[PDB]
Ligand binder design. Structure first.
Ligand SMILES: [Mn+2]
Ligand SMILES: [Mn+2]
Ligand SMILES: [Mn+2]
Ligand code: NA
Ligand code: NA
Length: 320
DNA sequence: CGGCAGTACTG
DNA sequence: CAGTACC
DNA sequence: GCCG
């Protein structure tokens, strides 16, 4: 915000490290970029840079070069491959390893990929919907998608609870996809739904492509009827009722919020996953060596916060 | 030095 | 298994 | 990359 002239430079590096496979450096840049954006003032010195959590020696140095000097030496030394690697890894189902392999084999455009690359089933779908999957939808369309899933699920069993999570539940104006979470208060009737539910959503022509079909998670592609509609990513997760609060929290995110909550859980000798909050977990030197611990009862998202000794945060307040 | 998350599909 | 993906 |  006050330092976008710094963060604009740093995000180019962050992206370059990401698509090249250096996930840890990329994580460090992403965190520092979020810290600099959230800051209350323009950073104007080295020791002020060091003041911020997430900015250490090397990041402060780069912020210092940006100031006064106006640019960053390293940006001029980013491999010419990065834009192509970004292009390739924006195919759903292709990550850094696949993108680098394609690059090594001589492929430089999606036309090369289309005409010469061997593609997995998922990657052919990702390529078929390449532009669509880079578009975010208006949240009103996320609502229509959630209600389509809900109506199809509640026709099989009216007791099923269905909730769109992710960025939708965090109140965002646009959504990259729809994350639909399904449970049943009876603790049992959630099981074996996908056979009927997915077949039902196919009958409409609503489901257009399947990317992942598991016993508890479906990842695929839908499209609402009528003209002017794009293909949209749809994820559906079925969970036992006892896990509903932790799944609500995890799949609402954001990813950084979840990461921050896992770190806090660790400081308290606990662990937090999409399935449960666990206590008296045993670490040896930050590594969970032994001590899986015990699952704590968490009927509500509020209980997770309370058991972590934290004040409750509405989903809109988790958009980190 | 070494964690920075666990969970699940695919092939 | 490695790779990719979910937040 | 950061940080304990
Ligand atoms: Mn989402
Ligand atoms: Mn999703
Ligand atoms: Mn389309
Ligand atoms: Na710092
Ligand atoms: Na991808």
């Amino acid at each position: 915000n006050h330092n976008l002239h710094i963060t604009e430079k740093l995000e180019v590096l962050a992206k370059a490290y990401s698509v090249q496979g250096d996930k840890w450096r990329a994580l460090g840049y992403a965190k520092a970029i979020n810290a600099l954006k959230s800051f209350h003032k323009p950073v104007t010195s080295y020791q002020e840079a060091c003041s911020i959590p997430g900015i250490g020696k090397r990041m402060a140095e780069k912020i210092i070069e940006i100031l006064e000097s106006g640019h960053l030496r390293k940006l001029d030394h980013i491999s010419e491959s990065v834009p192509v690697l970004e292009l390739f890894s924006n195919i759903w189902g292709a990550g850094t390893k696949t993108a680098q392999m394609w690059y090594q084999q001589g492929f430089r455009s999606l036309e090369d990929i289309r005409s010469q690359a061997s593609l997995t089933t998922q990657q052919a779908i990702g390529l078929k919907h390449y532009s669509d999957f880079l578009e975010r939808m208006p949240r009103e369309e996320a609502t229509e998608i959630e209600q389509t899933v809900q109506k199809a699920a509640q026709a099989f069993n009216s007791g099923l609870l269905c909730v769109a999570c992710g960025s939708y539940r965090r109140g965002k104006a646009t959504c990259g996809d729809v994350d639909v979470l399904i449970t049943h208060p009876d603790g049992r009737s959630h099981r074996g739904i996908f056979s009927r539910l997915l077949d039902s959503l196919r009958q409409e022509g609503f489901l257009t492509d399947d990317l992942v079909k598991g016993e508890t998670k479906y990842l695929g592609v839908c499209r609402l009827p009528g003209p002017g509609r794009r293909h949209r990513r749809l994820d559906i997760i079925v969970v036992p009722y006892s896990e509903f609060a932790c799944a609500l929290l995890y799949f609402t995110g954001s990813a950084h919020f979840n990461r921050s909550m896992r770190a806090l859980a660790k400081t308290k000798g606990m662990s937090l996953s999409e399935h449960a909050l666990s206590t008296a977990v045993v670490r040896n030197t930050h590594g969970a060596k032994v001590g899986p611990g015990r699952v704590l009862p968490t009927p509500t998202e509020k209980d997770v916060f309370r058991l972590l000794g934290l004040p409750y945060r509405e989903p809109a307040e988790r958009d980190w």
